[PDB]
Amino acid sequence: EGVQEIDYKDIATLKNYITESGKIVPSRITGTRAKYQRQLARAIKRARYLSLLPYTDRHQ
Amino acid sequence: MRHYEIVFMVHPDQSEQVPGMIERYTAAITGAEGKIHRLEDWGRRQLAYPINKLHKAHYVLMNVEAPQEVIDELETTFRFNDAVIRSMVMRTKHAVTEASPMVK
Amino acid sequence: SMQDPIADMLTRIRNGQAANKAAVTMPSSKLKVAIANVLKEEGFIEDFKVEGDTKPELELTLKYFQGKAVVESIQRVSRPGLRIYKRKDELPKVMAGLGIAVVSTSKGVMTDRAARQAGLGGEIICYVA
Amino acid sequence: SLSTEATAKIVSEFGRDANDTGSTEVQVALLTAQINHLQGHFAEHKKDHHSRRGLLRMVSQRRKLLDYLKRKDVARYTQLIERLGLRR
Amino acid sequence: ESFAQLFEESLKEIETRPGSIVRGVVVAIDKDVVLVDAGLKSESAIPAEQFKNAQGELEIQVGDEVDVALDAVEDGFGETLLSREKAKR
Amino acid sequence: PVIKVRENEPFDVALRRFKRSCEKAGVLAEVRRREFYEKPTTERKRAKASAVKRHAKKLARENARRTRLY
Amino acid sequence: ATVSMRDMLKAGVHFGHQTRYWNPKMKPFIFGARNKVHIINLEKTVPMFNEALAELNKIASRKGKILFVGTKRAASEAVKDAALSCDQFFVNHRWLGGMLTNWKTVRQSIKRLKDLETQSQDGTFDKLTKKEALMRTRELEKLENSLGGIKDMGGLPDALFVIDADHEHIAIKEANNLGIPVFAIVDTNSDPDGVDFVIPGNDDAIRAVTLYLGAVAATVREGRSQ
RNA sequence: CGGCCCCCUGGACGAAGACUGACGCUCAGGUGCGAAAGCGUGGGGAGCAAACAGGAUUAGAUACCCUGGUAGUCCACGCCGUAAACGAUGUCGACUUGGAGGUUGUGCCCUUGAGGCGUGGCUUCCGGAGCUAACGCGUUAAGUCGACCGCCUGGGGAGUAC
Ligand SMILES: [Mg+2]
Ligand SMILES: [Mg+2]
Ligand SMILES: [Mg+2]
Ligand SMILES: [Mg+2]
Ligand SMILES: [Mg+2]
Ligand SMILES: [Mg+2]
Ligand SMILES: [Mg+2]
Ligand SMILES: [Mg+2]
Ligand SMILES: [Mg+2]
Ligand SMILES: [Mg+2]
Ligand SMILES: [Mg+2]
Ligand SMILES: [Mg+2]
Ligand SMILES: [Mg+2]
Ligand SMILES: [Mg+2]
Ligand SMILES: [Mg+2]
Ligand SMILES: [Mg+2]
Ligand SMILES: [Mg+2]
Ligand SMILES: [Mg+2]
Ligand SMILES: [Mg+2]
Ligand SMILES: [Mg+2]
């Protein structure tokens, strides 16, 4: 798709790049490019701040 | 003028006041000649984790072109109003006048 | 900064000889052209060619004989940090007269032997062996 | 830093030919404006050492340029330092 | 006297050297191994394992121009990756 | 690391799955690392050493194994 | 006798190695790079090859002892065949360190081999407890395999035709130390500095190897015939 | 220098051009920045922890191990001005075979999809010539050269005394 910037509101893609426990997946495993990887990490963090994603696989 | 992007989560018990709040914020921005490029009430939503022990916060998204002084005032309003649980105003270069992925 | 263009040229020649490059190019100057001419006359290089109008580039065509460089050694003598001038009787003999010494005299840049014959000294630019 | 319009205005004011962005006087003016702008910031943020480093660099460059002007053409130097109000 | 022309005609006679397959004549037959020529930098001593029938006796003798997969050229000494690329699709 | 034992799933199988999940998470390793305070210098050193070790070993393996071993 | 370009192209001499493995001393003998595989300049190859052939022919004419050094298992058969075709000496299996530089020792080995072979074959005594026959046979095989080609060389060779300079680097070095002209086939990965008569070409490919042997063999035969 | 967000701000890099026209490089004295520990005044103090206490170990154990634990570590503003402050490699400029990578630009090409061919910048490893006492460095030089500065002249006494 050649997205200009990964979107923190775009949850499904993020959900594909976080593991079951909520941790950010390494770039070795996901195969993401470094520029995108950084962008993705930032987006995930923002979502977590907005309770769109969870910080951890804990109770809720 | 800096393109901003506001998202604020409101306490679900204050959900009946939410249309009015949106109107108020819009009115103030316009008053200060601020454009409003998209405005999406996402509605009631299940939190990924409980904030202040309460679930299902009412999310509003608002991409705006305004001056920073007015943005500051808006932020202050958010912080002091005991209805909006969280807020986040984050600068953007280009006004993303496009529908959000969850609405899309 | 570049502080010695002649020195740079000499260095270029040496490195070209080392790396077996056929020709070596550098920004041309009048002094440089004179030096190149002297070298060609003495036969340490095959040819030189100045090329361009606004900022011309001197291109020397280097000389090989049996796999090894003709210019065995080529040392700067006078340099910006320490100028060297000699009198006609003090003019140096490089490699006991086999190699040449480029000396800038009152009558232009010439080899050491020529200068000695003329009877005048000058700035000793470089030795070539 | 300095806004685009301001830079353009400065160039127009001191520039022999409005596209003369490189002229020495213009360069000095641009540096001067930047330095003046940054004073307020440094008054506020005394510990912004990196930024002050940048400011120092600007000042040094301006000084060097000014010296060059003095040596090359004195009348221009005198006029310029009168226009800008720089000590000596 | 001229090299571009002959080299480029030899080229035009290549189906696809880079990526998929070229035909080639057998150089020899071995035990679980068959040597098939390539015309490339070397010859393909491909494994005859992929050519294993059900009855144990091999169906490749000296001569066939089998559909060897002629990719991955110049692995140091020669070239060999597979020989059942087109023979499976 | 949430796990739920499926209907008519043996216990041993469930345990195996749980262990696997834990391993993927890498929880024990993290706790072990956080048992005592590693100095920043030490952490840097360990990382650098690991990088060197990996590169050298890989180079030896890829290269080094093109010879008659016996 | 020279070799044609059409034949060379058919053989596959022009192909070289990957661009990461080339030697920049072989950087002149390269035309281009098609699909990350070097292409050798046949324009520079053919005249050089011809010169080498002429020199080889001349040496044969003056009765020079050529040594065909080739150890690649692909080229071992071919080199051996060529040598025997033109009755010359070869090394198809591992080049023993100091075959030429330590010739008086490899000479001792050669003498031992000759004695063993003669007793084994012409002696035809057979009785040796059985152990001796098995052990002796193994020893004989090893010696014959290693030094069978140079057994009749008597002294040192007067020229060394060598398959692949990078693979047979030791041989080239030995030749250089003693001073013997070298006629090496040199792929793009190989180093040409030790070689006296560099022949750019594909050491790996069998057709190319065969072609090299055949041309050299023909020229040596012609020289000997004179 | 490491969560995220905002406000102020410095540098680097690419692209095309346009402009000034040697305005440059280095720099003794001088000036500024300068980890951690340490000092001053006022805050803060969860965790860790010099000193200190007790428990172990031991011939002893003013240590290592254990339980505690105050300065400190944290914040504001001053001072100090040193480290194996290391690449034990001064700054600036030019030239000299290569390979595999990483990061960030950028031109064209059918982007047959993450591609193909260039062209930069910074960066890790391997290695050639050359250099080196050797170890090794090797286009980011410890290679070939030019400019300026700092420094060395046997070990100790001593970076000590005045
Ligand atoms: Mg910035
Ligand atoms: Mg100009
Ligand atoms: Mg000083
Ligand atoms: Mg401190
Ligand atoms: Mg304090
Ligand atoms: Mg007090
Ligand atoms: Mg206090
Ligand atoms: Mg303790
Ligand atoms: Mg404690
Ligand atoms: Mg001290
Ligand atoms: Mg010191
Ligand atoms: Mg340090
Ligand atoms: Mg030292
Ligand atoms: Mg030091
Ligand atoms: Mg300086
Ligand atoms: Mg940097
Ligand atoms: Mg190295
Ligand atoms: Mg001393
Ligand atoms: Mg003494
Ligand atoms: Mg003292």
UniProtKB/Swiss-Prot annotation, chain E:
Residue span(s) of domain S1 motif: 19-85
Disrupted-gene phenotype: Essential, it cannot be deleted. Upon depletion cell growth and total protein synthesis become linear.
Post-translational modification: Phosphorylated; probably on a serine. (Microbial infection) ADP-ribosylated and RNAylated (about 30% of the modifications) by phage T4 ADP-ribosyltransferase ModB. This results in covalent RNA-S1 conjugates and allows the phage to reprogram the host's gene-expression system.
Subcellular localization, as worded in the UniProt entry: Cytoplasm
Induction statement: Represses its own translation via the N-terminus (at protein level).
Free-text note on domains in this protein's UniProt record: The 6 S1 motif domains are not equivalent; the first 2 no longer bind rRNA but instead are involved in protein-ribosome and protein-protein interactions. Binds to the 30S ribosomal subunit via its N-terminal fragment (190 residues, the first 2 S1 motifs) and allows translation by S1-free ribosomes. The same fragment represses its own translation. The first 3 S1 motifs do however bind to mRNA pseudoknots in the 5'-UTR of at least 1 mRNA (rpsO); deletion of S1 motifs 1-3 but not motifs 4-6 is not viable, although a deletion of motifs 4-6 grows slowly and is cold-sensitive.
Subunit structure of this chain's protein: Part of the 30S ribosomal subunit; the largest protein subunit, it is loosely associated and not always found in ribosomal crystal structures. Does not bind rRNA. Probably requires ribosomal protein uS2 to associate with the 30S subunit. Binds in the junction of the head, platform and main body of the 30S subunit; the N-terminus penetrates the 30S subunit while the C-terminus faces ribosomal protein uS2. Nascent polypeptide chains cross-link this protein in situ. Can be cross-linked to mRNA in the ribosome. (Microbial infection) During infection by bacteriophage Qbeta, part of the viral RNA-dependent RNA polymerase complex, the other subunits are the viral replicase catalytic subunit (AC P14647), host EF-Tu and EF-Ts.
Family statement: Belongs to the bacterial ribosomal protein bS1 family.
Role this protein plays: Required for translation of most natural mRNAs except for leaderless mRNA. Binds mRNA upstream of the Shine-Dalgarno (SD) sequence and helps it bind to the 30S ribosomal subunit; acts as an RNA chaperone to unfold structured mRNA on the ribosome but is not essential for mRNAs with strong SDs and little 5'-UTR structure, thus it may help fine-tune which mRNAs that are translated. Unwinds dsRNA by binding to transiently formed ssRNA regions; binds about 10 nucleotides. Has a preference for polypyrimidine tracts. Negatively autoregulates its own translation. It is not clear if it plays a role in trans-translation (a process which rescues stalled ribosomes). Evidence for its role; binds to tmRNA with very high affinity, is required for binding of tmRNA to 30S subunit. Thought to play a role only in translation of the tmRNA in vitro. Evidence against its role; overexpression of whole protein or various S1 fragments inhibits translation, they have no effect on trans-translation, and an in vitro system with S1-less ribosomes performs trans-translation.
Name this protein carries in UniProt: Small ribosomal subunit protein bS1
Species whose genome carries this gene: Escherichia coli (strain K12)
Residues of the full protein shown: 3 to 91 of 557
